[PDB]
Structure formats: structure tokens, C-alpha cells
């Protein structure tokens, strides 16, 4: 009953501002590194504590900003183990809160563009991608998307069954490869404080899976952190540029593989009433009816394993602003992703904008985060 006045009072509408709130040790305990005259005169160290131009180990972190950045993530592909170390020769201005928008993605990358890649997602790519973990199948429990400061937009059937138990989960944010945490910009988790489950969901035909995570303090801002604009109540999507993403349930913190880098599939819509005659082409018959909080992608021809994780968010350009993102969908089950003939049946997402922006209010969330 108290949870708007702490919303407001609380300023959870907004990002806490960078600076407002791991010792890499001694340089020769690092592995060492360097051939020719360097051999074994060099340090293997992660890139932000290695200046670009001189080669050299520096004091504090740095940042490099000229874009030219490339990093094979082959495993034995580098002169380093780690795919983030660069062998570096032996021997910070703290900004306010800036302005934020949703649906932006970096397609070039934070801090480098990667190579040797098959379906990996560069770093940061999409800022709006988060995990729910449990705190105490594995550790991911599924996936989800920014949509404010404060709160993450996942499926209801994801939630459900934690609803009085909420401290056995949480969310991670700004995460990338799932294996190290040598990443410049560090992933950021938060205590879920309510989670809002939609009135008509029912888990046993799917509809209306949908819920909002409503978490105890907002996300610090950085740049590998943003939220994902939302459509329009209704709002129908025509594009061949969408994408799933996700780490997958069982590699998700598996210590049993070089890396598990965030995973990002191309795909395109498919009309509603086409969608529902795919389906009506299969055992389920002509008289299945697709039921209209569900929309439908494109699927894979030889298929293995789904990428996009359970309560997810499908996203697609924005048709008045190509350069943005809006969520058109919210994956409904990792297996789910159909094939080259079915298509992948997704949570409407534009069928409940007005129930969120309903919730947001009630709770005294501003909902600018997910339009501006
Ligand atoms: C809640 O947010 C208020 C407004 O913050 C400003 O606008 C935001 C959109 C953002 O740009 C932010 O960076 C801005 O500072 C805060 O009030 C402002 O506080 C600053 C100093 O922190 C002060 O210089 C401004 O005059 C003040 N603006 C006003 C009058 O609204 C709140 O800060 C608290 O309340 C203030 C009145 C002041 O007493 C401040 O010392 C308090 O920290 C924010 N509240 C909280 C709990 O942080
Ligand atoms: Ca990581």
C-alpha cells in the first residue's frame, strides 16, 4: 500500500547516476605472455587496464573510444587464455546522469566488434536483455527486458511460482558472457521487490503470459544497461529484421565451456491469420484458432535448440524510427521457435500496452523510459 510514495519520493524512474554508489593484484602474478625479444617479458591482462596505443599496463581503468577495437573470441585464438586479455607491456572523471533512450542498439558493439563468431550478440548489443536467476535449467530460470529503471518485463509463467517466495530469485542486467567477468562494464543484479502477474494469465493455454518485475532500487546507468521501447496498444509488426536472443538454460554460468556469450538470431514476422494457418496445417487441425494475445516469427530450417530464452523479449525496428527497437514479443516457451514451415509462437506484447501503462501508474512509475 505504500509502494508509489517510495516510487516517487524515491525517484525510481530514473537510472542512479554512474559513480553515485577487484584488485587485479601484483602485475607479476599475472600469466605472462610476448614473443621474440618480449617472450615471457609481457603480461596477459583484460583489455580496460591496457592502454590501445602504448601497449601498456596502466594505473586505472581506461576507456577506448576510437572504435577500432576487434576481438577474436576463438578459444586459442590470441596470444591470452581469456579472449578479453590482451598481453600488455609492462610500466577517472565520474559523469552525472545523462539522457536516456529506449530501443538502442549497438551493432558495432561497446569497447570492440568481435570476429570468429557464429550466432554470438556483440557486447552490449542489446542493453535491454536480462536474466532471472535464482539466488540461492540451472541457474537461469529465464529471461526478460528492461523496460524502466526499475522494472523488467518477463513472461508470467516465469514468475508464478515465486510469487511469495520472490527472495529466491533475481535479476542480472548488463550481462554479456556469462563465464568471466572481465568485461569493462559489469553486469548489475537487483532483489525483485513485487511482481505483478496479469490477471488473465493461464498457464494451461498460455494466454495472457505476462507479468512485470518490479525491483527494489533502480539500475545504476551505463552504457551496456537501456531499456526496450514498447509498441502501441494493437500495434501490428511487418519487418524480416527482428531478433530473439538469449544464453540458453543449461549453458547459463556452466563453468564447463570456454564461454557462453549472450546468442542473437535474425527473424522475421508472420501475419497473424497466415500464422494460424501454418498451425492448422499440422495435427492441431483447421479448427485451432490462434488466440489473439499471440503473435508469431519465422522459424529454422534444420533445427536443434531454440535461441531465444523462456520469457524473453522478441524485438523489432520501430516502423517510425528504424534506428530503435520496441518489443513485439515475449517468448512464451524455449522450445517454442518453430521451424521452417511453423513458425514461433510469442506472447502478444502490443495486446497488453495498455494493462502495463495501467500497472506503471498504479505503482507510480513513469512510463516515459519505455517511449522516449
Ligand atoms: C529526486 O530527484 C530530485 C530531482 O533531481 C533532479 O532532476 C532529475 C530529473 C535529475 O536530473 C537529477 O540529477 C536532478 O538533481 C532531487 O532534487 C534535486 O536534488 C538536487 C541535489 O541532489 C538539487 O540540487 C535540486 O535542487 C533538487 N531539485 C528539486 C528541488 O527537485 C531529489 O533530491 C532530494 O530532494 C531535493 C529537494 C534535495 O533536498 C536533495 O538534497 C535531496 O537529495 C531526489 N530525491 C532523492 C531521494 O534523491
Ligand atoms: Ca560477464
Known amino acids: 500500500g505504500h509502494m508509489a510514495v517510495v516510487n516517487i519520493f524515491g525517484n525510481a524512474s530514473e537510472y542512479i547516476p554512474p559513480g553515485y554508489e577487484a584488485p587485479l593484484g601484483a602485475l607479476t602474478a599475472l600469466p605472462r605472455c610476448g614473443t621474440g625479444a618480449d617472450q615471457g617479458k609481457k603480461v596477459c591482462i583484460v583489455y580496460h587496464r591496457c592502454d590501445g596505443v602504448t601497449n601498456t599496463v596502466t594505473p586505472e581503468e581506461v576507456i577506448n573510444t576510437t572504435g577500432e577495437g576487434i576481438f577474436d573470441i576463438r578459444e586459442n585464438a590470441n596470444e591470452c587464455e581469456s579472449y578479453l586479455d590482451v598481453c600488455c607491456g609492462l610500466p577517472p572523471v565520474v559523469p552525472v546522469l545523462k539522457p536516456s533512450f529506449c530501443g538502442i542498439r549497438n551493432e558495432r558493439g561497446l569497447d570492440f566488434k568481435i570476429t570468429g563468431q557464429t550466432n554470438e550478440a556483440e557486447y552490449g548489443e542489446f542493453p535491454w536483455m536480462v536474466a532471472v536467476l535464482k539466488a540461492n535449467e540451472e541457474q537461469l530460470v529465464c529471461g526478460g527486458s528492461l523496460i524502466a529503471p526499475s522494472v523488467v518485463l518477463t513472461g508470467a509463467h516465469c514468475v508464478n511460482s515465486y510469487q511469495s517466495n520472490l527472495d529466491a530469485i533475481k535479476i542480472r542486467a548488463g550481462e554479456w558472457d556469462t563465464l568471466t567477468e572481465k568485461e569493462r562494464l559489469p553486469y548489475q543484479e537487483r532483489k525483485i521487490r513485487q511482481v505483478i502477474i496479469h490477471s488473465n494469465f493461464n498457464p494451461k493455454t498460455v494466454v495472457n503470459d505476462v507479468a512485470l518485475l518490479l525491483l527494489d532500487r533502480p539500475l545504476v546507468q551505463a552504457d551496456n544497461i537501456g531499456t526496450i521501447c514498447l509498441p502501441q496498444?494493437?500495434?501490428?509488426?511487418?519487418?524480416?529484421?527482428?531478433?530473439?536472443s538469449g544464453w540458453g538454460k543449461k549453458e547459463f554460468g556452466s563453468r564447463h565451456r570456454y564461454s557462453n556469450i549472450?546468442?542473437?538470431?535474425?527473424l522475421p514476422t508472420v501475419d497473424r491469420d497466415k500464422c494460424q494457418a501454418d498451425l492448422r496445417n499440422t495435427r492441431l487441425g483447421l479448427k485451432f484458432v490462434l488466440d489473439q494475445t499471440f503473435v508469431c516469427?519465422?522459424?529454422?530450417?534444420?533445427?536443434?535448440?531454440?535461441?531465444?530464452?523462456?520469457?524473453?523479449?522478441?524485438?523489432?525496428?520501430?516502423?517510425?524510427?528504424?534506428?530503435?527497437?520496441?518489443?513485439?514479443?515475449?517468448?512464451?516457451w524455449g522450445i517454442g521457435c518453430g521451424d521452417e514451415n511453423v513458425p514461433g509462437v510469442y506472447a502478444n506484447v502490443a495486446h497488453f500496452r495498455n494493462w502495463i501503462d495501467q500497472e506503471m501508474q498504479a505503482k507510480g512509475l513513469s512510463t516515459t523510459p519505455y517511449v522516449e
Open positions: 549472450l546468442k542473437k538470431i535474425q
Open positions: 516469427a519465422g522459424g529454422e530450417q534444420g533445427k536443434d535448440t531454440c535461441t531465444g530464452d523462456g520469457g524473453s523479449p522478441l524485438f523489432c525496428p520501430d516502423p517510425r524510427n528504424p534506428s530503435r527497437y520496441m518489443q513485439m514479443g515475449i517468448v512464451a
Open positions: 496498444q494493437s500495434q501490428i509488426f511487418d519487418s524480416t529484421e527482428c531478433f530473439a
